[PDB]
């Protein structure tokens, strides 16, 4: 399925993922696409910070859902 | 708009507030108050790595675990109005 | 003493028994809720959802959301006896 | 260290364990000593159900603690 990842500046990447994808895998895909080190990525969905070892299905992320990307400064 | 649970970005009701992610919610033995164990955004001398009164309830980095009453917390207002790329209602186009 | 994992009883007629799988405060509610997994299916139970939002996952019709303040440590298990007492524990601390 | 496992009917057994042992490890030890399949075992300590992939240390289970064994015979 396809999800969106949108930074606080509106910069958006589209990712092909499976519900079984771990958050760390999502972070690695983001680094590949935009080059942001995973350690800097805070991924947010439904008011929650996503943790590396969980899956997208653990957070009930849906087709075309938007994850928000906040960078650690 | 999403309430408070484990994983929630939270702010503690202080002037000014500070921020942490809820890592654990529970009422420990001997307390009649529901507590949130928070991982703070920035180190704080004295804070633990996820222990409360000798019991470990999660693991953070040293100096960044803080246990507060859940009622002392609210959703992190810095991120509570982030907007999605697309929305279900938009499908309606008549 | 109620945490995720606690065996809980809900006072009722008959009292429900379950394991706490989730503790939190959903949007709109002024008190903290426990999400319990019951042993058997119940009318009005879900599979982990409360007012449409999923908070955990269990079998169909086994999830019950109840005010934490209305749960108590399961009285049946609270009544089982340890092999070793606190007197023996105190003795161990010294010798 | 030594812990106890007591069935609801009061049959008690001692186990030799380590704080770092997993709950699944403890269930395997009960299977080895008593014959009870691990997937039938529901282990309770201090009012909480013990989950398979956590350690005794995670639950702060001390020497001479008593775990209670409920069987899921269904």
Residue C72 included in any domain: yes
Distance CA D15, CA D1 (A): 8
- Residue B34, token pair as written in the block: 């529901």
Distance CA B79, CA B25 (A): 21
Residue B19 included in any domain: yes
Residue C1 included in any domain: no
Contact yes or no for B65/B50 (Cβ under 8 A): yes
Number of domains within chain B: 1
Q: Is B15 on the interface with C (CB under 8 A)?
A: no
Name B4's bridge partners: C25
CB burial of residue C57 (10 Å; 0-12, 13-18, 19+)? middle
Distance CA D7, CA B53 (A): 31
Contact yes or no for D73/D9 (Cβ under 8 A): no
Which of B4, B5, B6, B28 would best serve as a mutation to test chain C binding (most C beta carbons within 10 A)?
A: B5
Q: Is D60 on the interface with B (CB under 8 A)?
A: yes
Interface of B with D in 24-43 (CB under 8 A): none
Residue B59 included in any domain: yes
Taking the CA atoms of C66, C69, C70 and C71 in sequence, report the sign of the dihedral they define. positive
User: Using CB atoms, which residue from A4, A46, A51 is nearest to B2?
Assistant: A46
Residue B66 included in any domain: yes
CATH code of the domain in which C48 resides: 2.30.30.190
Distance CA D2, CA A3 (A): 51
Contact yes or no for A69/A5 (Cβ under 8 A): yes
User: Using CB atoms, which residue from D4, D49, D66 is nearest to C7?
Assistant: D49
- Residue B21, token pair as written in the block: 């992610």
- Residue B48, token pair as written in the block: 């633990």
Name C67's bridge partners: C33
Q: How many CA atoms lie within 13 A of B85 on its CB side?
A: 19
Resolution (A): 1.9
Contact yes or no for B60/C31 (Cβ under 8 A): no
Domain extent, residue B24, equals 8-91
C-alpha pair distances (Å), A67 with each of A26, A63, B4, B24, B26: 10, 11, 18, 23, 28
Angle at D56 between CA D54 and CA D62, to 5 degrees: 160
- Residue B79, token pair as written in the block: 């991120």
Contact yes or no for C64/C70 (Cβ under 8 A): no
Comparing C-alpha atoms, which of C64, C11, C9 is closest to residue C42? C64
Question: What does R_g of chain D's alpha carbons equal in angstroms?
Answer: 11
Contact yes or no for D36/D26 (Cβ under 8 A): no
DSSP letter, residue A58: G
Q: Domains of chain D (ranges plus CATH)?
A: 2-71 (3.10.20.90)
Residue C87 included in any domain: yes
Other Cβ atoms less than 10 A from the Cβ of C60: the count is 10
C-alpha pair distances (Å), D32 with each of A55, D15, D35: 35, 11, 6
User: Using CB atoms, which residue from D4, D50, D64 is nearest to C92?
Assistant: D64
């Amino acid at each position: 399925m396809q999800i969106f990842v949108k930074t606080l500046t509106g910069k958006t990447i589209t990712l092909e993922v499976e519900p079984s994808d771990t958050i760390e895998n999502v972070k690695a895909k983001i680094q590949d696409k935009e080059g942001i080190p995973p350690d800097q990525q805070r991924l947010i969905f439904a008011g929650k910070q996503l943790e590396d070892g969980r899956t997208l299905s653990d957070y009930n992320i849906q087709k075309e859902s938007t994850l928000h990307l906040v960078l650690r400064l | 708009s999403h309430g408070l649970e484990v994983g929630s970005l939270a702010e503690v009701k202080e002037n000014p507030p500070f921020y942490g992610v809820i890592r654990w919610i529970g009422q420990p033995p001997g307390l009649n108050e529901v507590l949130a164990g928070l991982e703070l955004e920035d180190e704080c001398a004295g804070c633990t790595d996820g222990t409360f009164r000798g019991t470990r309830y999660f693991t953070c980095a040293l100096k960044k675990a803080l246990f507060v009453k859940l009622k002392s917390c609210r959703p992190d207002s810095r991120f509570a109005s982030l907007q999605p790329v697309s929305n279900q209602i938009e499908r309606c186009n008549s």
